[model samples]
Target: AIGPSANLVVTNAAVAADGHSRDAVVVNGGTPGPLITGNKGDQFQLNVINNLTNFTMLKSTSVHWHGFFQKGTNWADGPAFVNQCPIAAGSSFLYDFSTPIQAGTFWYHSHLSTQYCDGDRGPFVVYDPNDPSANLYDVDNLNTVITLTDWYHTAAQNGPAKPGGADATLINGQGRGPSSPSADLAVISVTAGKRYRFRLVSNSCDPNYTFSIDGHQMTIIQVDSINVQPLVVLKIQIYAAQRYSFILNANQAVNNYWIRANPNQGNVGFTNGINSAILRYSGAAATQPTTSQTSSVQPLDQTNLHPLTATAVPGSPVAGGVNLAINQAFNFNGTNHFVDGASFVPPTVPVLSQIVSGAQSAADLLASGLVYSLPSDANIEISFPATSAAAGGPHPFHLHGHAFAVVRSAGSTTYNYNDPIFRDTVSTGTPAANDNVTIRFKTNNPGPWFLHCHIDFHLEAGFAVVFAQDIPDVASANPTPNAWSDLCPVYDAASSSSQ
Candidate 1:
């Protein structure tokens, strides 16, 4: 039931695997591709196309229709290099947005570079134009898009090698571990009481997943794509490009269930950590398995529902809105630093000269010196510098598109303003070397967002930062005339040649 005039594209292809030929950035060539679905008002027309031949230059790209509220359309809203520029390579752009509002599950990656960790990314779905609580579940009952990625492998001797380093921690993109042999975790296949939906996407470029399925019992009902009133979770914690949408009722008894993804307690080394998946059910009555419903069920509320000051879709726009409140502070010495100070740098790209030229790994050069490092926005400041064991660990910060609320920490003021409890990602926990956290959000989703640091070599060495919010009717319909009104040349001959 997805059709408004559908015309999506998003290429950059060249895949062939096993027999050689890599280069991907698909959506049509298929990376996390397929699934575009539609409903909320509809009206799409994407058609992006780069084709990458090289020069991604200052490295800019665009495509941030995320959460859409609409306004002057922000020129297809893909803020790379701040709101426009870079889409050349083979050239194609043409976004044209309009999805209206209310539905669930959403995804779309690659703001460039970390190229969504070599895979570009996909899935957008919306559906529910007016299902209104009736919920509607059919389409083979839904359930297949687990997605939890983060894999790395580099042994080399002409043998193992696919750990281009950084960003490893996948699920649907497979890569969990028990020795990860490509580990796509069991490979999915459920049936019992039927009622599957599980569309939890983390796109882990930084890490912040807690998720669980063990015995089975979930009902979340959307988070990063809006809609929320349903709740039921045995365990769920997602960050790093967050997106959750639960509903697993496989019933139990049939056996098989393990969908874990961890890393939120001080970072680094937890023993091959954890990664699993298997919820078998199959058909043919499967030896008579499908009898379990004892009756007591109803208890799940993590909190959601409170976003919609306005939205009718079409070029997107809420109205006279634009409220930003950011207050930074980060300083960690004790050794590593990343609550903002940022730390951890190992691979200078030599890897023992590519393992003595044979090509890689002493366990991929000690897991590439344990990733996550960033610091240099002119040294950042909010206060940092203690010593002790040098405190550098537990760093998993992430924010792109918006989802904040953790008003104050470490000194513990714990703020909550009217049903406040929304997070795109936040992790500083184990911090005790002069810790502090004061997140807050509400530019209400305009453009250029992304706060960064979910690890992954600390977002490729530089932690990350990008704010930019210019949405007051698109800055009052592009008005800058009169240079703040004192009319031209407010004193300057280059300021008298810098005196």
Candidate 2:
């Protein structure tokens, strides 16, 4: 099999993601970029060639491996301003990193601005040779990767963001737009009488989806990069930046069936390509699904999920836990910011570089009020309980360095002492009046990590933070490469001209 490789070139092109023609920032000459795959523990360098210098909206770009723990390479964490500067347009940059601690469904996307929502994201899968659940499915091929995204007619940077609504939906980068001819839905060919493992990924900037097949139930085996107990569900709620590996058994008739993803987030009745994919049997005709959308057998509750590897959470509630009450407050300058007390700000210089230059304590990065410290190898629990009554929609919070166990989320509370589902991204649901989310991880990987919303607008508007885990070991853990040293000089020189 080919290793994860690319000569990824970014450029602006005319694409109808949902069948309507519009100029989009395309990668490798295609929308939704390209699917990059690798095995567990594989190390590699990805070349990102920025060819969008002639585009108007956003020419500079960067890629973030959403769930990979860049343990010893925080320089490759790829957040513009926070970790490193964006790759200059018409120039190329080397993203050096490894998948050392994770092996499951993950994704890569531009970590820059709303431009990413425009057209720069794709699914990344890491296969484990010794996967315990590998025997559960009959097929686990490259074709099993299914990507879901929101397609907007209005360019993300040109006109406006739909807030909670998308003009249309794209299933693996193809769908019919509202004003165009009906396009063919992405089809996944499958064998009858065999269970197929489909890696489902949601790379939408913002918009949750209730995902389901027309007539089959799915056995969910993994979440994000975390393996969880096989939970059977007729429908699953997938948010932006989250991934799930589920077993779809082809037990029905050898025909086409609609794969539905209904947009949810105060968005109902948005019917444009919501049923955007077709699950087709190998011998079936290339026909559209005649079957109607189906409802779930029972309501899906995420808090009921549990990790299968362990019987209970490692420690009691009071140990190394910290409670974080997140709220949005207006600053004196009229900018709204999400804050526990301080708004998050990205430093001009890389935090890891600053750490190497003797910025040892969390206080050293206080100007960007989001930096915090975690003791070495300590068990840490961070609770995000929404304190706002204004009803900020469910936020999918993502952590960079480590996968944490979801002890709580939404109003659904069940501290899984025996087995809490571990994941890199967890949702804090519609915080109208009450909502709570707590995740616990060990401070084993020593480096600066980010915790932020998956939403493009929320994050850009200042809803994020940095966790300087085990700062004492930062320099020793991440030895900066020579290329990283030159990142600032090249990118900084282009900032004034590009912006």
Candidate 3:
């Protein structure tokens, strides 16, 4: 038993990041297992019971405590194969860990195989300790978690009717019904002149999203549990697994306003899907406000948003790393496949040799390897010869934990220091291209944060790395050597005195 209830079980459940019920998983016999909430620094536990009749193994299944300082306490870290063995059917594992960070929007999901694609994910909210902001909100006020996801309709799921298979977009968890306008449109309720927080999370697997409230400016306060100096923006860019928190003031004439999120321009393809949510006035609108007919909008100039200051904690190791320069090219070959000369092959191919061939050929090069590969630990510097054009297409570069400030365009070589917009992901436009972005972060939280492309497939390919910052003294005090010691004790077993 835990908390206010006795032992709980989520059986045969179906989970899907997209909101379509039809496409949802039959996990624990339901969608979304349960809501798990706690406070920072508190010890938490969970008993995961698998009730499937068949011996269904959650292959590669593990949990990641996104944005938590969960080092040492590896059992609850939920990294599949890396931390512990899989949870066997009809068996269970007790996940226990202490939260060692401040409170903010956080989430948990199955890293096992593609269970997340099916829906084995849910929200993990931590209330702020000695709370001030939580006390300000009205108890009755509607608090909503708007998760942006990808949806694939049955027709699109198999393949696009004409072009081939297409991935559908979803809001909260709903896809557009056959009669619905588009998958992006979501109906939401809010009161006029009232301020509401829209906790935006990007859980999509294909494309990165640039989100905005069509006509209204939002006050962004925090990103990935780190609070930023307050700033206003018309649109915000969010990469996969990243989170953003902003306040939307519903002061306009009561009507529905479009919450639009689309793939970056010129980067659109069958995999780059669109998603949205609607913000409507509580009472009847004087009249139905016209919605934007277009699905995509141009991005605002990089000069409008507030500039971010280097806030790495005072004595942090990452406080003085060399900044990336304008038009500078850096080689990140540590674990990246494409850059390392490896490619992605679909699972349909059975033979390993055949799959390797399919991956190397240009025709079979789909962006499947981007998200699946492990990340690099070191950053390498390189010089791009002006004549090299073999790389092909744009690489959507992203930094984990912190957004970057583009200092100059690789094409123009222009520089600006005043009022640069902060972004976590940027596209190095086209082949033979050179671009430089200055990324800043205070080493406040110590963890292996990621820096990679937002393109899920590209990530699976290799273009990723860990931004390891120095851990705080408190967090490193009793560090465990690794996550494997406890699960398979033989790995950590010592010689007996008799021996």
All predictions: root-mean-square deviation over Cα?
24.4, 2.7, 10.2
Highest TM-score: which candidate?
2
Give the alpha-carbon lDDT of every model. 0.46, 0.76, 0.45
Query: Compared with the true structure, what per-residue lDDT tens digits does model 2 show for residues 197-297?
Result: 89999988888888888888898888887887888989888988888898999999999988877787533442554446888988999988788765577
What value does the lDDT take at residue 120 in candidate 1?
60
Q: What lDDT score is found at residue 462 in candidate 3?
A: 47
Model 2 regions lying over 4 Å from their true place: 265-273, 311-314, 317-335, 389-391
Residue-pair clashes per candidate: 27, 5, 42
TM-score of 3: 0.63
- TM-score per candidate, chains pooled: 0.27, 0.93, 0.63
Cα lDDT of model 1 by residue, 246-279, tens digit: 7777776665445566645322222342354455
User: What local lDDT score does residue 448 receive in model 1, on the 0 to 100 scale?
Assistant: 32
Highest lDDT, which number?
2
Candidate 1, residue 485: the lDDT equals 21
Tell me the lDDT of model 3 at 20.
41
